Protein backbone atom coordinates (compact mmCIF):
# COMPACT_ATOMS: atom_id res chain seq x y z
CA UNK A 1 0.00 0.00 0.00
CA UNK A 2 2.92 2.35 0.69
CA UNK A 3 4.50 2.11 -2.72
CA UNK A 4 1.04 2.11 -4.30
CA UNK A 5 0.48 5.50 -2.66
CA UNK A 6 3.92 6.58 -3.87
CA UNK A 7 2.94 5.54 -7.40
CA UNK A 8 -0.33 7.43 -6.93
CA UNK A 9 1.62 10.59 -6.07
CA UNK A 10 3.79 10.00 -9.15
CA UNK A 11 0.67 9.54 -11.29
CA UNK A 12 -0.97 12.71 -9.98
CA UNK A 13 2.25 14.63 -10.69
CA UNK A 14 2.23 13.15 -14.21
CA UNK A 15 -1.40 14.18 -14.71
CA UNK A 16 -0.56 17.70 -13.54
CA UNK A 17 2.24 17.70 -16.12
CA UNK A 18 -0.30 16.54 -18.70
CA UNK A 19 -2.62 19.43 -17.77
CA UNK A 20 0.39 21.76 -18.06
CA UNK A 21 0.00 21.60 -21.86
CA UNK A 22 -3.58 22.89 -21.56
CA UNK A 23 -2.32 25.54 -19.14
CA UNK A 24 0.25 26.67 -21.72
CA UNK A 25 -2.32 26.65 -24.53
CA UNK A 26 -4.56 28.83 -22.33
CA UNK A 27 -2.04 31.68 -22.52
CA UNK A 28 -0.99 30.81 -26.08
CA UNK A 29 -4.34 32.00 -27.43
CA UNK A 30 -4.65 34.67 -24.75
CA UNK A 31 -3.64 38.10 -26.11
CA UNK A 32 -0.91 38.23 -23.47
CA UNK A 33 1.75 39.86 -25.69
CA UNK A 34 0.90 43.40 -24.40
CA UNK A 35 0.47 43.26 -20.62
CA UNK A 36 3.49 40.97 -20.27
CA UNK A 37 5.67 43.38 -22.27
CA UNK A 38 4.66 46.31 -20.07
CA UNK A 39 5.23 44.29 -16.89
CA UNK A 40 8.68 43.13 -17.96
CA UNK A 41 9.57 46.68 -19.04
CA UNK A 42 8.61 48.14 -15.66
CA UNK A 43 10.44 45.25 -13.96
CA UNK A 44 13.55 46.15 -15.96
CA UNK A 45 13.11 49.80 -14.94
CA UNK A 46 12.87 48.78 -11.28
CA UNK A 47 15.91 46.52 -11.69
CA UNK A 48 18.00 49.36 -13.11
CA UNK A 49 16.72 51.84 -10.50
CA UNK A 50 18.90 50.10 -7.91
CA UNK A 51 21.83 50.01 -10.35
Amino acid sequence: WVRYEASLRQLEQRQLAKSVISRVQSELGNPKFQEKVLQQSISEIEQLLSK
Binding site: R9, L16, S43
Partner: protein, 506 residues
Amino acid sequence: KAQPTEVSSILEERIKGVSDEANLNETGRVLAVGDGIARVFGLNNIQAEELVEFSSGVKGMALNLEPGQVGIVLFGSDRLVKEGELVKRTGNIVDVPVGPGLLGRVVDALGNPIDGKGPIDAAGRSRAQVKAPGILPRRSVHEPVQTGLKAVDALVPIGRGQRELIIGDRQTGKTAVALDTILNQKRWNNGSDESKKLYCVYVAVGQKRSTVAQLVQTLEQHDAMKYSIIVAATASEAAPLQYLAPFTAASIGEWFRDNGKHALIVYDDLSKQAVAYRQLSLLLRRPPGREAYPGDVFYLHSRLLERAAKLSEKEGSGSLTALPVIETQGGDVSAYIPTNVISITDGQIFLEAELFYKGIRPAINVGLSVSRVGSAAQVKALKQVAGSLKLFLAQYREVAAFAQFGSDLDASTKQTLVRGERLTQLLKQNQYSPLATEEQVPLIYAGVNGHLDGIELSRIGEFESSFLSYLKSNHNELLTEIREKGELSKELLASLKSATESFVAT
Protein backbone atom coordinates in the same frame (compact mmCIF):
# COMPACT_ATOMS: atom_id res chain seq x y z
CA LYS B 1 -1.77 18.16 -2.72
CA ALA B 2 -0.70 21.46 -1.17
CA GLN B 3 3.00 20.53 -1.36
CA PRO B 4 3.38 20.88 -5.16
CA THR B 5 1.45 24.15 -4.91
CA GLU B 6 3.63 25.82 -2.31
CA VAL B 7 6.89 24.52 -3.78
CA SER B 8 5.85 25.87 -7.20
CA SER B 9 4.90 29.19 -5.61
CA ILE B 10 8.22 29.44 -3.75
CA LEU B 11 10.29 28.53 -6.82
CA GLU B 12 8.40 31.00 -9.00
CA GLU B 13 8.77 33.74 -6.37
CA ARG B 14 12.51 33.06 -6.28
CA ILE B 15 12.56 33.32 -10.08
CA LYS B 16 10.73 36.65 -9.86
CA GLY B 17 13.22 37.91 -7.28
CA VAL B 18 16.15 36.83 -9.46
CA SER B 19 14.59 38.65 -12.43
CA ASP B 20 14.09 41.78 -10.31
CA GLU B 21 17.78 41.74 -9.25
CA ALA B 22 19.90 40.14 -11.98
CA ASN B 23 21.75 42.87 -13.95
CA LEU B 24 23.52 40.16 -15.96
CA ASN B 25 25.32 41.92 -18.81
CA GLU B 26 28.64 40.11 -19.35
CA THR B 27 26.72 36.84 -19.71
CA GLY B 28 27.86 34.78 -22.67
CA ARG B 29 26.37 33.91 -26.05
CA VAL B 30 27.02 30.49 -27.56
CA LEU B 31 29.14 30.48 -30.72
CA ALA B 32 29.55 26.78 -31.53
CA VAL B 33 28.06 23.85 -29.61
CA GLY B 34 29.58 20.51 -30.56
CA ASP B 35 28.78 17.05 -29.22
CA GLY B 36 27.79 17.78 -25.64
CA ILE B 37 30.13 20.79 -25.32
CA ALA B 38 29.65 24.43 -26.34
CA ARG B 39 32.10 27.28 -26.93
CA VAL B 40 30.68 30.58 -25.65
CA PHE B 41 31.92 34.15 -26.07
CA GLY B 42 31.53 36.48 -23.12
CA LEU B 43 31.56 35.61 -19.41
CA ASN B 44 34.58 37.84 -18.89
CA ASN B 45 34.31 37.19 -15.14
CA ILE B 46 33.66 33.43 -15.30
CA GLN B 47 35.52 31.31 -12.78
CA ALA B 48 37.21 28.18 -14.06
CA GLU B 49 35.06 25.04 -13.64
CA GLU B 50 32.18 27.26 -12.51
CA LEU B 51 28.62 26.04 -13.06
CA VAL B 52 26.57 27.88 -15.68
CA GLU B 53 22.91 27.71 -16.67
CA PHE B 54 22.06 27.73 -20.37
CA SER B 55 18.89 29.38 -21.62
CA SER B 56 17.61 25.91 -22.56
CA GLY B 57 18.12 24.75 -18.96
CA VAL B 58 21.11 22.45 -19.49
CA LYS B 59 23.80 23.10 -16.89
CA GLY B 60 27.43 23.57 -17.87
CA MET B 61 30.94 23.74 -16.47
CA ALA B 62 34.01 25.64 -17.69
CA LEU B 63 37.13 23.53 -18.24
CA ASN B 64 39.09 25.62 -20.77
CA LEU B 65 38.85 29.42 -20.64
CA GLU B 66 40.43 30.47 -23.92
CA PRO B 67 40.96 34.19 -24.59
CA GLY B 68 37.52 35.39 -25.67
CA GLN B 69 35.70 32.05 -25.72
CA VAL B 70 35.44 29.46 -22.94
CA GLY B 71 34.67 25.78 -23.37
CA ILE B 72 31.53 24.71 -21.51
CA VAL B 73 30.97 20.99 -20.98
CA LEU B 74 27.25 20.27 -20.82
CA PHE B 75 25.75 18.25 -17.96
CA GLY B 76 23.17 16.75 -20.28
CA SER B 77 22.12 16.44 -23.89
CA ASP B 78 22.84 19.05 -26.56
CA ARG B 79 19.35 18.67 -28.07
CA LEU B 80 18.07 21.85 -26.44
CA VAL B 81 21.09 24.16 -26.73
CA LYS B 82 21.56 26.13 -29.95
CA GLU B 83 23.88 28.81 -31.29
CA GLY B 84 23.33 32.27 -29.84
CA GLU B 85 21.63 30.97 -26.69
CA LEU B 86 22.13 32.90 -23.47
CA VAL B 87 24.21 31.24 -20.74
CA LYS B 88 23.77 32.21 -17.09
CA ARG B 89 26.80 31.79 -14.85
CA THR B 90 25.84 30.52 -11.40
CA GLY B 91 28.70 32.44 -9.76
CA ASN B 92 29.96 29.45 -7.76
CA ILE B 93 32.24 26.51 -8.51
CA VAL B 94 30.34 23.28 -9.17
CA ASP B 95 29.29 21.61 -5.92
CA VAL B 96 27.14 18.72 -4.70
CA PRO B 97 24.61 18.59 -1.84
CA VAL B 98 26.10 16.79 1.17
CA GLY B 99 24.82 15.66 4.54
CA PRO B 100 23.13 12.77 6.34
CA GLY B 101 19.89 13.10 4.37
CA LEU B 102 21.60 11.73 1.26
CA LEU B 103 21.47 8.29 2.91
CA GLY B 104 18.72 6.13 1.47
CA ARG B 105 18.69 8.14 -1.77
CA VAL B 106 20.01 7.72 -5.31
CA VAL B 107 21.42 10.87 -6.90
CA ASP B 108 23.04 11.81 -10.20
CA ALA B 109 26.45 13.42 -10.68
CA LEU B 110 25.17 16.85 -9.63
CA GLY B 111 23.41 15.36 -6.60
CA ASN B 112 19.87 15.85 -7.88
CA PRO B 113 17.55 13.04 -6.75
CA ILE B 114 16.89 10.50 -9.50
CA ASP B 115 15.21 7.77 -7.42
CA GLY B 116 11.90 9.65 -7.38
CA LYS B 117 11.78 9.75 -3.57
CA GLY B 118 11.45 13.52 -3.18
CA PRO B 119 13.86 16.41 -2.67
CA ILE B 120 17.29 15.90 -1.14
CA ASP B 121 17.81 17.15 2.41
CA ALA B 122 21.42 18.36 2.56
CA ALA B 123 23.28 19.66 5.60
CA GLY B 124 25.36 21.81 3.25
CA ARG B 125 27.02 22.18 -0.13
CA SER B 126 30.57 20.92 -0.70
CA ARG B 127 32.67 21.63 -3.77
CA ALA B 128 32.98 18.77 -6.23
CA GLN B 129 36.71 19.56 -6.44
CA VAL B 130 38.08 19.61 -2.87
CA LYS B 131 41.77 19.57 -1.98
CA ALA B 132 42.87 16.37 -0.27
CA PRO B 133 43.94 16.50 3.39
CA GLY B 134 47.57 17.30 4.06
CA ILE B 135 50.29 15.21 5.64
CA LEU B 136 49.47 16.14 9.24
CA PRO B 137 45.62 16.02 9.33
CA ARG B 138 45.66 12.37 8.24
CA ARG B 139 46.29 9.44 10.57
CA SER B 140 47.80 6.00 10.03
CA VAL B 141 45.16 3.49 8.98
CA HIS B 142 44.58 1.17 11.94
CA GLU B 143 40.82 0.66 12.14
CA PRO B 144 39.88 -2.25 9.84
CA VAL B 145 37.05 -2.22 7.32
CA GLN B 146 35.23 -5.53 7.79
CA THR B 147 34.68 -6.73 4.23
CA GLY B 148 33.09 -10.01 5.31
CA LEU B 149 34.92 -12.20 2.77
CA LYS B 150 37.58 -14.62 3.98
CA ALA B 151 40.20 -14.21 1.25
CA VAL B 152 40.26 -10.41 1.07
CA ASP B 153 40.15 -9.94 4.85
CA ALA B 154 42.88 -12.51 5.48
CA LEU B 155 45.25 -11.55 2.65
CA VAL B 156 44.47 -7.94 1.66
CA PRO B 157 42.75 -6.22 4.62
CA ILE B 158 41.09 -2.84 4.05
CA GLY B 159 41.09 -0.25 6.81
CA ARG B 160 39.30 3.00 7.55
CA GLY B 161 40.79 5.61 5.23
CA GLN B 162 42.64 3.06 3.10
CA ARG B 163 42.38 3.10 -0.70
CA GLU B 164 42.20 -0.47 -2.03
CA LEU B 165 41.83 -0.94 -5.78
CA ILE B 166 39.55 -3.75 -7.01
CA ILE B 167 41.43 -4.31 -10.27
CA GLY B 168 40.18 -7.02 -12.58
CA ASP B 169 38.97 -8.13 -15.97
CA ARG B 170 35.40 -7.88 -17.25
CA GLN B 171 32.71 -9.45 -15.03
CA THR B 172 35.30 -11.05 -12.74
CA GLY B 173 33.56 -10.10 -9.49
CA LYS B 174 34.70 -6.49 -9.07
CA THR B 175 31.29 -5.00 -8.33
CA ALA B 176 30.49 -8.31 -6.61
CA VAL B 177 33.25 -7.97 -4.02
CA ALA B 178 32.32 -4.30 -3.83
CA LEU B 179 28.79 -5.45 -2.96
CA ASP B 180 29.92 -7.90 -0.28
CA THR B 181 32.03 -5.14 1.28
CA ILE B 182 28.96 -2.89 1.02
CA LEU B 183 26.60 -5.39 2.66
CA ASN B 184 28.88 -6.56 5.47
CA GLN B 185 28.56 -3.16 7.17
CA LYS B 186 24.94 -3.87 8.15
CA ARG B 187 26.24 -5.65 11.27
CA TRP B 188 27.59 -2.40 12.73
CA ASN B 189 25.41 0.20 10.98
CA ASN B 190 22.33 -1.28 12.70
CA GLY B 191 23.90 -0.58 16.11
CA SER B 192 24.52 2.65 18.00
CA ASP B 193 28.33 3.07 18.13
CA GLU B 194 29.02 5.68 15.46
CA SER B 195 32.76 5.00 15.77
CA LYS B 196 32.08 1.55 14.26
CA LYS B 197 29.32 2.64 11.87
CA LEU B 198 30.65 2.89 8.32
CA TYR B 199 28.39 4.79 5.91
CA CYS B 200 28.59 3.69 2.29
CA VAL B 201 28.80 5.63 -0.99
CA TYR B 202 28.55 3.77 -4.31
CA VAL B 203 29.75 5.45 -7.51
CA ALA B 204 27.94 4.00 -10.53
CA VAL B 205 29.87 5.82 -13.25
CA GLY B 206 29.50 4.28 -16.70
CA GLN B 207 27.21 1.49 -15.50
CA LYS B 208 23.84 1.07 -17.16
CA ARG B 209 20.58 2.09 -15.50
CA SER B 210 19.40 -1.53 -15.33
CA THR B 211 22.56 -2.43 -13.40
CA VAL B 212 21.97 0.50 -11.03
CA ALA B 213 18.39 -0.69 -10.46
CA GLN B 214 19.73 -4.19 -9.76
CA LEU B 215 22.14 -2.57 -7.30
CA VAL B 216 19.56 -0.46 -5.47
CA GLN B 217 17.10 -3.35 -5.15
CA THR B 218 19.85 -5.69 -3.94
CA LEU B 219 20.80 -3.14 -1.28
CA GLU B 220 17.10 -2.77 -0.43
CA GLN B 221 16.63 -6.50 0.18
CA HIS B 222 19.57 -6.94 2.57
CA ASP B 223 18.63 -3.92 4.75
CA ALA B 224 21.52 -1.93 3.28
CA MET B 225 20.01 0.95 1.29
CA LYS B 226 19.40 2.95 4.48
CA TYR B 227 23.13 3.55 5.11
CA SER B 228 24.38 3.45 1.50
CA ILE B 229 24.57 6.28 -1.02
CA ILE B 230 24.20 5.73 -4.77
CA VAL B 231 25.81 8.28 -7.09
CA ALA B 232 24.86 7.07 -10.56
CA ALA B 233 26.57 8.38 -13.71
CA THR B 234 24.72 6.60 -16.51
CA ALA B 235 26.55 5.97 -19.77
CA SER B 236 23.67 7.65 -21.60
CA GLU B 237 24.18 10.68 -19.37
CA ALA B 238 26.62 13.27 -20.66
CA ALA B 239 30.32 12.47 -20.38
CA PRO B 240 30.95 15.49 -18.08
CA LEU B 241 28.46 13.94 -15.64
CA GLN B 242 30.46 10.70 -15.69
CA TYR B 243 33.66 12.70 -15.18
CA LEU B 244 32.23 14.63 -12.23
CA ALA B 245 30.13 12.02 -10.39
CA PRO B 246 33.07 10.32 -8.58
CA PHE B 247 34.30 13.75 -7.47
CA THR B 248 30.87 14.68 -6.09
CA ALA B 249 30.61 11.32 -4.33
CA ALA B 250 34.09 11.97 -2.93
CA SER B 251 32.80 15.27 -1.53
CA ILE B 252 29.79 13.44 -0.08
CA GLY B 253 32.10 10.96 1.64
CA GLU B 254 34.36 13.79 2.79
CA TRP B 255 31.33 15.24 4.57
CA PHE B 256 31.16 12.10 6.71
CA ARG B 257 34.95 12.00 7.06
CA ASP B 258 35.21 15.57 8.37
CA ASN B 259 32.32 15.10 10.84
CA GLY B 260 33.95 12.26 12.78
CA LYS B 261 32.19 9.53 10.78
CA HIS B 262 33.70 6.77 8.65
CA ALA B 263 32.71 6.55 4.98
CA LEU B 264 33.37 3.80 2.43
CA ILE B 265 33.15 5.05 -1.16
CA VAL B 266 33.50 2.40 -3.87
CA TYR B 267 34.74 4.05 -7.07
CA ASP B 268 33.26 1.23 -9.10
CA ASP B 269 34.28 1.30 -12.74
CA LEU B 270 36.27 4.59 -12.80
CA SER B 271 37.67 3.32 -16.10
CA LYS B 272 34.40 4.53 -17.60
CA GLN B 273 35.14 7.83 -15.87
CA ALA B 274 38.61 7.65 -17.41
CA VAL B 275 37.25 7.22 -20.94
CA ALA B 276 34.56 9.85 -20.32
CA TYR B 277 37.29 12.31 -19.35
CA ARG B 278 39.23 11.21 -22.43
CA GLN B 279 36.15 12.20 -24.45
CA LEU B 280 36.01 15.52 -22.59
CA SER B 281 39.62 16.31 -23.46
CA LEU B 282 39.38 15.05 -27.05
CA LEU B 283 36.45 17.32 -27.86
CA LEU B 284 37.79 20.19 -25.75
CA ARG B 285 40.66 20.47 -28.29
CA ARG B 286 43.14 19.24 -25.68
CA PRO B 287 45.84 17.10 -27.35
CA PRO B 288 46.00 13.62 -25.81
CA GLY B 289 48.89 11.74 -24.25
CA ARG B 290 49.19 7.95 -24.35
CA GLU B 291 46.75 5.78 -26.34
CA ALA B 292 44.72 8.99 -26.88
CA TYR B 293 44.18 9.38 -23.13
CA PRO B 294 44.64 12.99 -21.97
CA GLY B 295 47.58 14.15 -19.91
CA ASP B 296 45.84 14.36 -16.53
CA VAL B 297 44.20 11.00 -16.18
CA PHE B 298 46.92 10.19 -13.64
CA TYR B 299 46.46 13.56 -11.95
CA LEU B 300 42.68 13.12 -12.13
CA HIS B 301 42.72 9.67 -10.54
CA SER B 302 45.27 10.67 -7.90
CA ARG B 303 43.51 13.91 -6.94
CA LEU B 304 40.16 12.12 -6.72
CA LEU B 305 41.49 9.19 -4.68
CA GLU B 306 43.68 11.20 -2.29
CA ARG B 307 40.52 12.75 -0.83
CA ALA B 308 40.00 9.37 0.86
CA ALA B 309 42.02 9.35 4.08
CA LYS B 310 41.96 8.53 7.79
CA LEU B 311 41.78 11.85 9.61
CA SER B 312 43.61 12.37 12.89
CA GLU B 313 41.94 12.75 16.28
CA LYS B 314 42.47 16.51 16.08
CA GLU B 315 40.33 16.52 12.91
CA GLY B 316 37.57 14.39 14.45
CA SER B 317 39.20 10.97 13.88
CA GLY B 318 36.99 10.50 10.82
CA SER B 319 37.90 8.34 7.86
CA LEU B 320 36.98 8.01 4.21
CA THR B 321 37.68 4.61 2.65
CA ALA B 322 38.09 4.28 -1.12
CA LEU B 323 37.39 1.11 -3.13
CA PRO B 324 38.20 2.01 -6.74
CA VAL B 325 37.92 -0.41 -9.65
CA ILE B 326 39.91 -0.95 -12.85
CA GLU B 327 38.46 -2.92 -15.77
CA THR B 328 41.55 -4.41 -17.38
CA GLN B 329 41.52 -5.59 -21.00
CA GLY B 330 42.40 -9.27 -21.24
CA GLY B 331 44.15 -9.38 -17.88
CA ASP B 332 46.55 -6.60 -18.92
CA VAL B 333 47.71 -5.38 -15.53
CA SER B 334 50.75 -3.81 -17.23
CA ALA B 335 48.71 -1.08 -18.90
CA TYR B 336 48.74 2.70 -18.45
CA ILE B 337 45.50 3.20 -16.48
CA PRO B 338 45.85 -0.02 -14.37
CA THR B 339 49.41 0.58 -13.17
CA ASN B 340 48.58 4.27 -12.80
CA VAL B 341 45.72 3.59 -10.38
CA ILE B 342 47.71 0.87 -8.60
CA SER B 343 50.38 3.48 -7.89
CA ILE B 344 47.66 5.60 -6.23
CA THR B 345 45.69 3.10 -4.17
CA ASP B 346 47.09 1.69 -0.93
CA GLY B 347 47.25 -1.74 -2.50
CA GLN B 348 45.15 -3.53 -5.10
CA ILE B 349 42.77 -6.49 -5.26
CA PHE B 350 43.36 -8.47 -8.45
CA LEU B 351 40.61 -10.62 -9.98
CA GLU B 352 41.01 -12.55 -13.22
CA ALA B 353 38.72 -14.94 -15.04
CA GLU B 354 41.44 -17.58 -14.63
CA LEU B 355 40.72 -18.08 -10.92
CA PHE B 356 37.02 -17.31 -11.44
CA TYR B 357 36.56 -20.38 -13.64
CA LYS B 358 39.20 -22.31 -11.68
CA GLY B 359 36.78 -22.27 -8.75
CA ILE B 360 37.90 -19.38 -6.57
CA ARG B 361 34.57 -17.63 -6.10
CA PRO B 362 35.97 -14.35 -4.72
CA ALA B 363 38.53 -14.77 -7.55
CA ILE B 364 41.13 -13.34 -5.16
CA ASN B 365 44.49 -13.51 -6.94
CA VAL B 366 46.66 -13.71 -3.84
CA GLY B 367 49.75 -12.96 -5.92
CA LEU B 368 49.03 -9.52 -7.37
CA SER B 369 46.53 -8.68 -4.62
CA VAL B 370 48.55 -6.88 -1.93
CA SER B 371 47.48 -4.53 0.86
CA ARG B 372 49.75 -1.71 1.99
CA VAL B 373 48.80 -2.16 5.69
CA GLY B 374 48.91 -5.83 6.66
CA SER B 375 49.31 -5.88 10.44
CA ALA B 376 47.38 -2.64 10.87
CA ALA B 377 43.85 -2.27 9.49
CA GLN B 378 43.19 -5.91 10.43
CA VAL B 379 41.26 -7.62 13.21
CA LYS B 380 43.59 -8.56 16.06
CA ALA B 381 42.00 -12.02 16.25
CA LEU B 382 42.85 -12.52 12.56
CA LYS B 383 46.17 -10.71 12.12
CA GLN B 384 48.77 -12.99 13.69
CA VAL B 385 47.37 -14.56 16.93
CA ALA B 386 49.05 -17.93 16.25
CA GLY B 387 51.74 -16.55 13.92
CA SER B 388 50.68 -18.52 10.84
CA LEU B 389 47.81 -16.09 10.26
CA LYS B 390 50.43 -13.37 9.72
CA LEU B 391 52.62 -15.15 7.15
CA PHE B 392 49.43 -16.51 5.58
CA LEU B 393 50.26 -14.44 2.49
CA ALA B 394 53.84 -15.72 2.35
CA GLN B 395 52.55 -19.29 2.68
CA TYR B 396 50.16 -18.69 -0.22
CA ARG B 397 53.03 -17.31 -2.30
CA GLU B 398 55.06 -20.42 -1.48
CA VAL B 399 52.14 -22.66 -2.46
CA ALA B 400 51.94 -20.82 -5.78
CA ALA B 401 55.72 -21.17 -6.23
CA PHE B 402 55.61 -24.96 -5.62
CA ALA B 403 52.16 -25.79 -7.01
CA GLN B 404 51.25 -29.03 -8.78
CA PHE B 405 53.63 -28.12 -11.62
CA GLY B 406 56.55 -28.39 -9.21
CA SER B 407 57.85 -31.85 -8.41
CA ASP B 408 56.37 -33.39 -5.26
CA LEU B 409 59.68 -33.62 -3.41
CA ASP B 410 58.88 -35.45 -0.17
CA ALA B 411 56.29 -35.86 2.58
CA SER B 412 56.94 -32.27 3.68
CA THR B 413 56.27 -31.09 0.12
CA LYS B 414 53.12 -33.22 -0.04
CA GLN B 415 51.93 -31.72 3.25
CA THR B 416 52.64 -28.19 2.00
CA LEU B 417 50.75 -28.86 -1.24
CA VAL B 418 47.80 -30.31 0.69
CA ARG B 419 47.80 -27.32 3.05
CA GLY B 420 47.79 -24.88 0.14
CA GLU B 421 45.06 -26.71 -1.75
CA ARG B 422 42.84 -26.92 1.34
CA LEU B 423 43.47 -23.24 2.09
CA THR B 424 42.48 -22.03 -1.39
CA GLN B 425 39.51 -24.40 -1.15
CA LEU B 426 38.45 -22.67 2.07
CA LEU B 427 38.71 -19.13 0.70
CA LYS B 428 35.79 -19.61 -1.72
CA GLN B 429 32.75 -17.68 -0.51
CA ASN B 430 29.25 -17.50 -1.97
CA GLN B 431 27.97 -14.16 -3.21
CA TYR B 432 25.85 -11.97 -0.92
CA SER B 433 27.14 -13.97 2.08
CA PRO B 434 29.26 -11.59 4.20
CA LEU B 435 31.05 -13.77 6.74
CA ALA B 436 31.97 -11.91 9.93
CA THR B 437 35.39 -11.85 11.57
CA GLU B 438 34.07 -13.67 14.65
CA GLU B 439 33.34 -16.46 12.19
CA GLN B 440 36.32 -15.86 9.89
CA VAL B 441 38.91 -16.43 12.63
CA PRO B 442 37.87 -20.02 13.53
CA LEU B 443 37.91 -20.96 9.84
CA ILE B 444 41.35 -19.46 9.20
CA TYR B 445 42.64 -21.23 12.32
CA ALA B 446 41.11 -24.49 11.07
CA GLY B 447 43.06 -23.95 7.85
CA VAL B 448 46.28 -24.42 9.82
CA ASN B 449 45.28 -27.32 12.11
CA GLY B 450 42.87 -30.04 10.99
CA HIS B 451 42.94 -28.79 7.39
CA LEU B 452 45.06 -31.60 5.95
CA ASP B 453 42.71 -34.47 6.88
CA GLY B 454 39.72 -32.99 5.06
CA ILE B 455 37.56 -35.61 3.35
CA GLU B 456 37.91 -34.54 -0.31
CA LEU B 457 38.43 -30.95 -1.44
CA SER B 458 34.86 -30.52 -2.69
CA ARG B 459 33.42 -31.31 0.75
CA ILE B 460 35.17 -28.37 2.44
CA GLY B 461 32.32 -26.20 1.15
CA GLU B 462 29.84 -28.00 3.40
CA PHE B 463 32.52 -28.51 6.06
CA GLU B 464 32.72 -24.73 6.47
CA SER B 465 28.96 -24.44 7.01
CA SER B 466 29.01 -27.33 9.49
CA PHE B 467 31.91 -25.71 11.36
CA LEU B 468 29.98 -22.42 11.57
CA SER B 469 26.98 -24.32 12.94
CA TYR B 470 29.26 -26.08 15.43
CA LEU B 471 30.66 -22.75 16.61
CA LYS B 472 27.09 -21.46 16.99
CA SER B 473 26.02 -24.30 19.31
CA ASN B 474 27.38 -23.99 22.89
CA HIS B 475 30.41 -22.20 21.42
CA ASN B 476 28.82 -18.76 20.94
CA GLU B 477 30.79 -17.80 24.05
CA LEU B 478 33.98 -18.18 22.00
CA LEU B 479 32.42 -16.32 19.07
CA THR B 480 31.38 -13.34 21.19
CA GLU B 481 34.73 -13.43 23.03
CA ILE B 482 36.66 -13.12 19.77
CA ARG B 483 34.17 -10.54 18.47
CA GLU B 484 34.31 -8.24 21.50
CA LYS B 485 37.84 -8.51 22.91
CA GLY B 486 39.50 -8.44 19.49
CA GLU B 487 42.66 -10.18 20.66
CA LEU B 488 42.97 -13.91 21.33
CA SER B 489 44.35 -15.14 24.65
CA LYS B 490 46.31 -18.35 25.18
CA GLU B 491 43.31 -19.98 26.86
CA LEU B 492 41.18 -18.81 23.93
CA LEU B 493 43.63 -20.41 21.49
CA ALA B 494 43.55 -23.65 23.50
CA SER B 495 39.74 -23.64 23.48
CA LEU B 496 39.68 -23.02 19.72
CA LYS B 497 42.16 -25.86 19.18
CA SER B 498 40.04 -28.18 21.32
CA ALA B 499 36.89 -27.25 19.38
CA THR B 500 38.68 -27.79 16.07
CA GLU B 501 39.93 -31.22 17.18
CA SER B 502 36.46 -32.18 18.43
CA PHE B 503 34.88 -31.16 15.12
CA VAL B 504 37.51 -32.84 12.92
CA ALA B 505 37.05 -35.99 15.00
CA THR B 506 33.38 -36.07 13.97
